[PDB]
Amino acid sequence: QGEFDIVQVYKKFLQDDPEITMPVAAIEALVQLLSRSQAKTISEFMDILQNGSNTLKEGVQNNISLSAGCDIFQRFVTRSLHDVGDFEQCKRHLVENGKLFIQRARACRQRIAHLGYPLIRDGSVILTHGFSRGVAAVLLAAAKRHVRFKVFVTESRP
Amino acid sequence: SNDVPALFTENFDYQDIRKDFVYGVLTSDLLGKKIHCHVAKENYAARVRSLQTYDAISKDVLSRWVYPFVPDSNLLNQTFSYQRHQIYKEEDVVLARSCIIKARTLIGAYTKVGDASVVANTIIGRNCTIGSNCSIDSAFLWEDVVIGDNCRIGKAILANSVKIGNNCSIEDGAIVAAGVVIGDNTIIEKNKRLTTFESHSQGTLNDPSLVGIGGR
Incomplete structure (x- = not known):
């Protein structure tokens, strides 16, 4: 087990909620894939989500908005990322800022209206x-x- | 000029500013004085003295002949807004679908308009409310006025806090006072002024209030 084919988590959120689009789903999936993970090196982290995104990206017929949303998501995380002193700050700063993206993401459709x-x-x-x-x-x-x-x-x- | 008051204590017969004062200066009844006219050729100026003017000035006001002094300016923190064909509304007003508003119409805030009603060339105070399937033309409505469903109003003044039931009708020249209520299925003929007090005119409040009478 561990992290199953996150497309399931992806597919689940579509059924746990149909009123949310495909992009916001994967972002809700990766954060889980980031949360339920212990990498011990920054390399493994980004080596995962790249394979994580591409899998999702290769899953759906290379949907633009999805392939868009994921690529944006990565660069937000790895932007202000830095390793100082301890290590858990890394995974901390990721999922914390990663959680923030989603919060900012799902609320976008409201701002527009x-x-x-x-x-x-x-x-x-x-x-x-x-x-x-x-x-x-x-x-x-x-x-x-x-x-x-x-x-x-x-x-x-x- | 400051002479005028002292010129009025003296020459005490003068009561009217035009019939008595002017005629006195021109007839030399006053010790050889002069007056002058400054004929304006732009802007606007008039005063409210007659029912045949209140109606006129209002149209001359809605038609922006006296800018800036216009609802759209909202000098008393009102929430008016000009719309095309000289129709004026206020914030937090409710206009039903199928209710249509024609030109030269003004709507105060907090006022309801039922379905399939037609307003035209009409001024409406705030906190009013109109029934459904009605027709109003060239009328005047003030604050806290209600209107029954399916009623016909025209060329009449309706004072503050007036209740009109359904099926009612009311034609030109009609004038009411505050508190007066008209019962359902009723008409009021031309120029038939009324009141809510015991004075000169033929008014009483309770419903109905014309052929069916209260107070009498």
Whole structure:
């Protein structure tokens, strides 16, 4: 056992929560893969998540947002990272700052809505293409503020 | 000028500023004085003296003829905002869907408007509330006024804190006072002023208040 195919953890969070997208899942997976790990060298740590990310990256059909999200996640961790005195600070600074990223990540879709809904004006007419949770939040946040508007929707083949 | 008061204690017959004072200077009834006119050719100036002016000035105010002195300026920390076709609203107001607002309309805050109602050329005080499937035109509404469902209002002044039931109707020239209530399924003819006190006009508060009467 130890750390099973984190794609499971990845896949679990999709079922533990469907209202969260694919990028935020892997970030929630790696932090676990970082948490349930004892590497004793900074090399092993980053040697894992690279193989950790690429596995996830090779898992889904090289999804952009995912392959995007993971690569950003790494560079945030290894940025202000430094080894001073003891070692547990490393894993500490990783998962701690790693946890912070997710907190900042999941709350992004909220910030957008708080900035987007003033674009929707009373009686305006909106046009969107396909499904997109981003468009959803802002449009909903409009109605929940009680504004009148109509929207079109594209069939979005395929 | 400072002469005028002393010029009014003397010559005590003068009561009206124009009928008595001016005519006195021009007829030399006053010891040879002069007056002058400064005819303005821009900006705006008038005063509220008559019902046929309050209606006029209001339209001359909503139409921004007296900028900056305009709702959109909100000199008393109001929350107004100009919208196209000269319609004015306030924050924390609720306008139902299917309720439509035409031009020259002003809405105070904290005021409800029911479904399928039509307001036009109308000024509405704050804390009001309108029923549903109604029609209002060229009217005047003040604070804390309610309106029943499916009622027709037009060219009338409705004072503070007035309650109107459903099915009611009210035509031009109508004038009410505060507290007055009109019962459902009722009409009020032209210019039929009313009150809530025992004075001269024909008003009483309870519902209904015209053919069905209170106080009498």
